[PDB]
Amino acid sequence: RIVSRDIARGYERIPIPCVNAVDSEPCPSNYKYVSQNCVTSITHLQYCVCIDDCSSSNCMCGQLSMRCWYDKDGRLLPEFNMAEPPLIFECNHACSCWRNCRNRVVQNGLRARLQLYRTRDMGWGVRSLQDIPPGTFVCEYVGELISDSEADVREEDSYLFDLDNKDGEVYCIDARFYGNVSRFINHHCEPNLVPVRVFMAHQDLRFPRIAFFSTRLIEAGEQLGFDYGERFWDIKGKLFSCRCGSPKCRH
Ligand SMILES: COc1cc2nc(NCCCN(C)C)nc(NC3CCN(Cc4ccccc4)CC3)c2cc1OC
Ligand SMILES: Nc1ncnc2c1ncn2[C@@H]1O[C@H](CSCC[C@H](N)C(=O)O)[C@@H](O)[C@H]1O
Ligand SMILES: [Zn+2]
Ligand SMILES: [Zn+2]
Ligand SMILES: [Zn+2]
Ligand SMILES: [Zn+2]
Numbered sequence: 001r002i003v004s005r006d007i008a009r010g011y012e013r014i015p016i017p018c019v020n021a022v023d024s025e026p027c028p029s030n031y032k033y034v035s036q037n038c039v040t041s042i043t044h045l046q047y048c049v050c051i052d053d054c055s056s057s058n059c060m061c062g063q064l065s066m067r068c069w070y071d072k073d074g075r076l077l078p079e080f081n082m083a084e085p086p087l088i089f090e091c092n093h094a095c096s097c098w099r100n101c102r103n104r105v106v107q108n109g110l111r112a113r114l115q116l117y118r119t120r121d122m123g124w125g126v127r128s129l130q131d132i133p134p135g136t137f138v139c140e141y142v143g144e145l146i147s148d149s150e151a152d153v154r155e156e157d158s159y160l161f162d163l164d165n166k167d168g169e170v171y172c173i174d175a176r177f178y179g180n181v182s183r184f185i186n187h188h189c190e191p192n193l194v195p196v197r198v199f200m201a202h203q204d205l206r207f208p209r210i211a212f213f214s215t216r217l218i219e220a221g222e223q224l225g226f227d228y229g230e231r232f233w234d235i236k237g238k239l240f241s242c243r244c245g246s247p248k249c250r251h
């Protein structure tokens, strides 16, 4: 029937339609679509000095990533260990390389043709309208960046992605009132998307960015999903059962 032409309202390089042929509930509007994080609650050094397309072994940023994992087409190398994702550091404005060097994928926005859609049982969900090759940057988990003690007083918490730093202090990315398409991605015990911490510029290790990548071929039409984790299923895991229906589910 078609609900909305673009839930992003123009904030994405390509629109993101909403379709509901499951019931009569209208597309959501009780939140605000942002494409970049909203921050509610030293030295900017960490650059490279390349003169190439950052395709060499002398790229500091690439080295800070262990190695530049992006191939000529912005995808991860088969070498990438989707099991335990390495922190990725991309080129910024402190670097000497041009705005279009190999080491720049997440900073170039969304490229996938996505679409919000009503699920028969999970409420709202996200899916691809085109084949997405594995190890492809899909979308970032944008939202309001709140503190540890700020989330401790927010009733709704079904849109909280933690940013755990083993240094006592923890932060979160709240997507309830503000966020992007990622706030609709459902949980799956056998995830096709994997969160990868990424650093661009003006952020310390406490505040990385969450960039989702495809962990295998996500065939056109498939429903996107990532592993919410221990944290979530501990507080919600007792309000409902995991309606994933996957032959290996665990909640
Ligand atoms: C990874 O997905 C979740 C992450 C969460 N992270 C925090 N971080 C803050 C914890 C405490 N401070 C120190 C940060 N709190 C949560 N729930 C909170 C549990 C306590 N409630 C108390 C409360 C409930 C209702 C009304 C008023 C207060 C607020 C939400 C979370 C719930 C999640 O799944 C849902
Ligand atoms: N695999 C899964 N099984 C059961 N519920 C899920 C789920 N993935 C997501 N959800 C549901 O969605 C919330 C996560 S936020 C994702 C948005 C949600 N489906 C919506 O329609 O607003 C949780 O509160 C949970 O009830
Ligand atoms: Zn600067
Ligand atoms: Zn470089
Ligand atoms: Zn660089
Ligand atoms: Zn570069």
Ligand SMILES: [Zn+2]
Binding pocket: 187, 188, 189, 190, 242, 243, 244, 245, 246, 248, 249, 250, 251
């Ligand atoms: Zn499951």
